[PDB]
Amino acid sequence: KIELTFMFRGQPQEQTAYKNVVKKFEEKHPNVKVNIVVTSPDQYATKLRAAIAGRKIPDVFYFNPGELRAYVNSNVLLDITKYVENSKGVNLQDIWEKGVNKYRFDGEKVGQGNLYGLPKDLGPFALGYNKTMFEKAGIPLPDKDKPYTWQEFIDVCKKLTKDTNGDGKLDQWGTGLNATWTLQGFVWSNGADWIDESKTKVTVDDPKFIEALQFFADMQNKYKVTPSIAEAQTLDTYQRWLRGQLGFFPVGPWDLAAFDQQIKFEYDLIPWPAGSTGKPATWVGSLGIGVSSMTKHPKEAVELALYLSADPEGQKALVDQRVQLPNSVKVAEEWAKDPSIKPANKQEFLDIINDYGHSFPTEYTYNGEWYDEFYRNLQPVLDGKMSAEEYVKKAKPKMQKLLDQAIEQEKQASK
Numbered sequence: 001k002i003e004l005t006f007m008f009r010g011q012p013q014e015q016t017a018y019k020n021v022v023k024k025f026e027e028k029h030p031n032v033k034v035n036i037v038v039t040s041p042d043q044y045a046t047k048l049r050a051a052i053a054g055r056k057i058p059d060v061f062y063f064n065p066g067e068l069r070a071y072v073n074s075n076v077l078l079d080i081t082k083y084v085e086n087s088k089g090v091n092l093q094d095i096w097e098k099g100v101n102k103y104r105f106d107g108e109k110v111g112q113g114n115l116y117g118l119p120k121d122l123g124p125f126a127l128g129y130n131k132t133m134f135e136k137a138g139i140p141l142p143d144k145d146k147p148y149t150w151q152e153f154i155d156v157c158k159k160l161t162k163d164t165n166g167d168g169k170l171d172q173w174g175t176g177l178n179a180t181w182t183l184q185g186f187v188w189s190n191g192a193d194w195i196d197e198s199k200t201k202v203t204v205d206d207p208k209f210i211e212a213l214q215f216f217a218d219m220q221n222k223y224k225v226t227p228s229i230a231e232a233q234t235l236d237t238y239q240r241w242l243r244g245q246l247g248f249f250p251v252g253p254w255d256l257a258a259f260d261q262q263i264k265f266e267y268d269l270i271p272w273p274a275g276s277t278g279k280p281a282t283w284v285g286s287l288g289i290g291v292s293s294m295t296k297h298p299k300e301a302v303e304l305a306l307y308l309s310a311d312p313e314g315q316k317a318l319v320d321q322r323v324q325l326p327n328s329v330k331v332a333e334e335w336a337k338d339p340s341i342k343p344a345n346k347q348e349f350l351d352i353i354n355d356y357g358h359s360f361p362t363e364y365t366y367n368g369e370w371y372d373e374f375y376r377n378l379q380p381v382l383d384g385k386m387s388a389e390e391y392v393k394k395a396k397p398k399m400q401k402l403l404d405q406a407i408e409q410e411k412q413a414s415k
């Protein structure tokens with residue numbers, strides 16, 4: 001008799017996996033029916049924004065940790081503390097503390113207090129390499145613990161860039177990194193960030209930021225260890241990685257099902273190359289599962305969120321379907337140690353979570369518009385038409401004005 005709407009996003013392999021686990025939920029709870037609204041990752045934010053603007057909020061939905069404070073102030077998210085505490089067996093202490101705490105808010109700051117959502121996952125973004133390619137080229141394998149320096153990374157990438165089938169044309173490249181998701185590590189490992197320590201001042205004009213951004217663009221334009229602009233336009237580098245054309249490409253746990261289906265070469269995980277700090281860096285992603293403050297069935301809505309986030313049966317089904325690593329720390333640890341589950345160095349994912357992964361800058365700000373502005377006009381830098389130095393000087397005041405406005409919202413909306 002009960003009906004819940006569950007809104008979320010995913011790549012095709014993720015949509016299938018969560019639809020399957022929702023069906024499992026419905027088998028376990030024959031009185032609850034779940035109506036699914038699913039979208040591509042790229043369409044999700046617009047669709048969810050529209051639902052919230054209309055105050056037509058799905059019972060259960062994915063949301064961005066950077067929106068937690070805004071969602072609490074606007075009464076979007078139900079406080080689920082008591083339903084979680086009263087639930088049968090569920091103990092959120094087996095779950096990554098880093099994950100759980102992103103969705104706690106005590107009235108003033110994130111990380112403590114009442115629960116306003118549950119972690120979908122933690123998403124450490126690792127660096128993968130094509131071991132088949134390395135071994136066919138006679139190049140010594142990357143070390144699983146010691147990061148390449150930037151110079152060493154470029155060196156090995158040049159060695160991997162070649163005409164393998166002998167038709168006179170390059171057909172294999174060292175890498176082909178997407179700035180949207182892989183610039184952060186180079187920036188962070190070079191001792192820079194988009195914003196300052198206090199999270200109130202834009203710092204993209206830092207010489208260390210500029211160096212990292214120029215190095216990134218230079219992979220394509222100067223060192224030439226990527227497909228050309230035209231070649232990437234013909235077929236994007238994610239697809240070229242899948243077809244075995246690239247030495248290096250990032251790997252998230254959400255990728256594993258798709259990679260199981262499409263990747264026919266051997267690959268493994270390594271630390272990201274390290275800039276001036278000598279320490280590798282990358283991001284640890286997360287999404288929240290929240291419950292509408294306006295839901296007519298809070299108990300069943302939280303049961304669904306718990307099933308996806310924390311229930312050993314729901315969790316086991318998601319991990320088996322290769323779209324995430326276990327939310328339970330002990331289970332993740334035994335998972336990482338199981339050699340029959342590839343890649344071999346799965347442990348790298350845990351090392352990112354525990355040691356050298358960071359949050360996206362927008363997780364600290366009231367909205368992310370200031371950061372979206374940086375990326376909106378970035379492509380001329382990436383294609384070598386504008387220097388990194390010239391762009392960040394132009395972008396910084398635009399970003400700062402947006403950040404200042406986000407801060408003023410934090411103040412006004414929280415009266």
Ligand SMILES: OC[C@@H]1O[C@@H](OC[C@@H]2O[C@@H](OC[C@@H]3O[C@@H](OC[C@@H]4O[C@@H](OC[C@@H]5O[C@@H](OC[C@@H]6O[C@@H](O)[C@H](O)[C@H]6O)[C@H](O)[C@H]5O)[C@H](O)[C@H]4O)[C@H](O)[C@H]3O)[C@H](O)[C@H]2O)[C@H](O)[C@H]1O
Nearest residue numbers: 041064065122123177178181236238254255285286287360
């Ligand atoms: O190179 C130029 C570009 O290439 C062409 O576009 C090709 C792109 O490739 C395809 O995308 C491949 C995927 O992209 C990377 O994954 C990035 C995103 O992760 C997935 O979501 C997982 C989810 O996110 C994690 O949380 C991250 C953040 O943390 C919070 O702060 C915030 O809420 C989150 O956003 C969670 O832990 C986890 O559950 C998304 O699906 C994906 O977008 C990986 O390399 C691949 O999976 C795709 O076809 C194109 O985008 C174009 O020409 C040019 O743009």
Ligand SMILES: [Ca+2]
Nearest residue numbers: 163167169171
């Ligand atoms: Ca060739």
